[PDB]
């Protein structure tokens, strides 16, 4: 189905089927611990998929997704293309946005430490929320080298990572009207997902059991260790493997 979602006329609701529609898009290997294992490996033509996101004041962009790790590659607003400076979006380029009239290629790949750098500001100081999606939204619909590595931060955590955890999807979708600085909670869950999902495979393998222990940050701002699928983490919050 096209996956889009529209900020005018927003609700926490209709936030929440945007995500729960980007990631029924994603391809399962299988489940885990009823969670969706992503495929590890697709050829290209399978693994892509689009997301369109329209700001209030009706202007669109198209975002392209890596299927395999819900990793942001690019976006598209209007008849130009832009993809992040690494190898996976170099590779999504031949397959999605092909008949962009203009391309280019953004000068950073989409890895946090490098747009952080590239922003000159880290995510925990870096407004979320519906009205922060729309003002990044406009800013990469227009955009601007010097502003686009903090809207791409915006955007990315507002689509890869609601889709990966819904504690995050719920967060960013209660703030319809107001935006609001990410707790370290929700920086913690973004750092650990490729920690975690390995954690909770490797427990698959060793009778629902972690081989390492993965420290976390809750809402309450403290540090809590997770070490089997017993926990809250795994059974009531992360989406996607
Ligand atoms: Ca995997």
Same mark, same amino acid.
């Given at each position: @189905? ?20 980007? $990631? ?7 489940? &885990? %611990?009823?969670?969706?294992? +992503?495929?590890?490996? &697709? ?19 198209? /975002?392209?997704?890596? /299927?395999?790790?819900? %990793?942001? @590659? ?19 380029? *031949?397959?999605?946005? *092909?008949? #962009? @009239?203009?391309?280019? !290629?953004?000068? %950073? ?11 000159? *500001?880290? $995510? ?7 009205? #922060? ?5 406009? !800013? ?10 903090? #809207?791409? @931060?915006?955007?990315?955590?507002? !689509? ?14 209660? $703030?319809?009207?107001?935006?609001? &600085? ?6 913690? +869950? ?7 999902? *390995? ?23 403290? $540090? ?18």
């Amino acid at each position: @189905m096209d996956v889009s979602f529209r900020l005018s006329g927003a609700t926490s609701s209709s936030y929440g089927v945007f995500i729960s529609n980007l $990631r029924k898009a994603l391809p399962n290997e299988r489940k &885990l %611990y009823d969670i969706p294992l +992503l495929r590890s490996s &697709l050829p290209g033509s399978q693994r892509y998929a689009l997301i369109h996101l329209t700001n209030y004041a009706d202007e669109t962009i198209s /975002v392209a997704i890596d /299927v395999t790790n819900v %990793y942001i @590659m690019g976006y598209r607003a209007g008849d130009t293309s832009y993809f992040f400076n690494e190898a996976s979006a170099t590779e999504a380029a *031949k397959y999605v946005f *092909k008949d #962009a @009239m203009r391309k280019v !290629t953004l000068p %950073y790949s989409g890895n946090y430490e490098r747009l952080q750098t590239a922003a000159g *500001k880290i $995510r925990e100081n870096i407004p979320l929320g519906l009205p #922060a999606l729309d003002s990044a939204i406009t !800013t990469l619909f227009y955009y601007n080298a010097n502003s686009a590595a903090s #809207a791409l @931060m915006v955007l990315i955590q507002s !689509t890869s990572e609601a889709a990966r955890y819904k504690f995050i999807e719920q967060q960013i979708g209660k $703030r319809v009207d107001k935006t609001f &600085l990410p707790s370290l909670a929700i920086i913690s +869950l973004e750092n650990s997902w490729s920690a975690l999902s *390995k954690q909770i495979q490797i427990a698959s393998t060793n009778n629902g059991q972690f081989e390492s222990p993965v420290v976390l940050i809750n809402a309450q701002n403290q $540090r809590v260790t997770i070490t089997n699928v017993d926990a809250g983490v795994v059974t009531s919050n992360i989406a996607l493997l």
